[PDB]
């Protein structure tokens, strides 16, 4: 229920989703939608407003059940049907669906997401022309400089009430952070690494590499690079919706994820500085090379 | 690893068992010496510097490893042994031990807290006239009104983007939170309902009832009860010390519990609020009966 809430109240994610679905109703006047995890219906319900023929809801989680109850409160049941269970095994009462909605992001965009269950039902279940939304995604890296964090989860361990824990260095760098960034301790422009386009994208394609070019735009010493996504809304509408969750865009639930240096470096305003990234599937992990060294974070 | 260096940057908690450590030397010096719950091992090295004879450090988690390295690199290893294990399965290479320590508290004292592992401990493993510490334990409760908050909980629900939720409220309700409380929003002086000394508590006596009276000092609408707890270091002590994790506090960790009022109702000050609360172990849970209805929480 809490993560439930928490996404609700996250004013980017929900009215991003809203004004998509209101402003563009051309899009589902009429259609009969899938609404990929779809929680407590909230979509669900705004694609019925806007017009829906018919909403099937999925969902493995309990809260389908709430879903239940919200959507006979709402007195649509006779448009939204919800179906408790994975996309992969549920039976559905169509063949085919016009129009997929689905809000399945993960941190970094693919930490544990839904985006596997959004294809699947893409390929399984999209009637042929159909339309997949949020349509276009995108992840980006930053690069940042903040020495007194650094020296909080790193150099904190050296000296601990009087006592060496230096090993823990090594526990504490393969992390991960979620954390919303001061935008003040960005040292670059950003750089995307990954473009996903949901109606052309593949499971396999969800690993990838990528070099990449940060452009330095302070001299500092570089002590993390951080990572976002931008969501967008692009197919056949007028009204095209997008959203940042970046450290330079209003906060969202997703924060931003912070890939720590175990060896901060100096960099100079101008630099381009150079990287690469790639992504796995194993529990995603992200190795990083950067300044002659090569790390591997989870969350 | 998070919740050992979060721990470890609890002041008031690291702090006061340094203290009550270094400025009680004459209850390690030349003593045999139990860590219960070990974690990083550090309560095991005050203890050596303050002079134990031989420390034992248990944990059943993989962080004893780490504790490993770090007791080799401050050249403890002579004096403190660590096992891996629970402490009702390790073998112990003493038949008893003349002190337990332990960092076992957990949110609102009881909640997924290692006491039962100290009392074991202790009944199995502590030497006859030995002493455990914290030796003193107690819980309180104490009255909120935060009517700005209640309606973010609850009335939140009844309009969602237009639509109706009023049934989520069900689920939030009886969900304890666990949350840091602005202390201008404390409208009784507090109660203990429950005082433990470690020495004499069984397992059974973890599971309680009390009536118990709060006195209203600001006439408000009552939105919520707040818990907390106070941890003390008393038995032959020369310098006795005492945190609280309560409001009026610096803030730990263990922040405090809230239990939501579904029907928040009105208090004037001077009035003696009456009420009774229970904690069951199942997954603890605590039933409060207040203003005539009764609501039983977890967490
Ligand atoms: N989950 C809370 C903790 C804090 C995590 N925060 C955290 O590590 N945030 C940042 C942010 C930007 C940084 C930039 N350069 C270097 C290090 C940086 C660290 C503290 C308690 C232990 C677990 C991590
Ligand atoms: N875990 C973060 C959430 C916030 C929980 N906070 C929270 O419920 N805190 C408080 C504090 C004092 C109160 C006093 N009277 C009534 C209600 C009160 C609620 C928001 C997102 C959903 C989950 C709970
Ligand atoms: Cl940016
Ligand atoms: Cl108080």
């Not at 969902?59 to 006979?72: C, G, H, V």
């Not at 969800?206 to 951080?226: G, N």
């Not at 924060?255 to 240096?261: E, I, N, P, R």
């Amino acid at each position: 229920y809490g993560i439930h809430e928490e996404m609700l109240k996250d004013k980017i994610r929900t009215e991003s989703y809203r004004d998509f679905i209101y402003q563009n109703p051309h899009i589902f006047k009429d259609k009969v939608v899938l609404d990929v995890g779809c929680g407590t219906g909230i979509l669900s319900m705004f694609a019925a407003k806007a017009g829906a023929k018919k909403v099937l809801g999925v969902d493995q989680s309990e809260i389908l059940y709430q879903a239940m109850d919200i959507i006979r409160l709402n007195k649509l049941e006779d448009t939204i049907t919800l179906i408790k269970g994975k996309i992969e095994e549920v039976h559905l009462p169509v063949e085919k669906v016009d129009v997929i909605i689905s809000e399945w992001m993960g941190y970094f965009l693919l930490f544990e997401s839904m985006l596997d269950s959004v294809l699947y039902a893409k390929n399984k279940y999209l009637a042929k022309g159909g339309s997949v939304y949020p349509d276009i995604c995108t992840i980006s890296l930053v690069a940042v400089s903040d020495v007194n964090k650094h020296a909080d989860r790193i150099a904190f361990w050296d000296d601990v009430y009087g006592f060496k824990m230096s090993c823990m260095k090594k526990a504490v760098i393969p992390e991960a952070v979620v954390e919303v960034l001061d935008p003040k301790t960005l040292i670059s422009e950003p750089c995307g690494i990954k473009h996903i386009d949901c109606h052309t994208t593949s499971i396999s394609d969800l690993e990838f590499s990528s070099d990449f070019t940060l452009k330095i735009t302070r001299t500092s010493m570089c002590t993390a690079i951080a990572g976002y996504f931008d969501i967008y809304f692009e197919k056949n509408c007028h009204n095209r919706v997008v959203f940042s969750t970046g450290p330079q865009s209003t906060k969202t639930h997703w924060k931003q994820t912070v890939f720590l240096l175990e060896k901060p470096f100096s960099v100079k305003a101008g630099e381009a500085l150079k990287g690469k990234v790639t992504v796995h599937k194993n529990s995603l992990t992200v190795t990083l090379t950067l300044n002659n060294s090569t790390q591997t974070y989870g969350l």
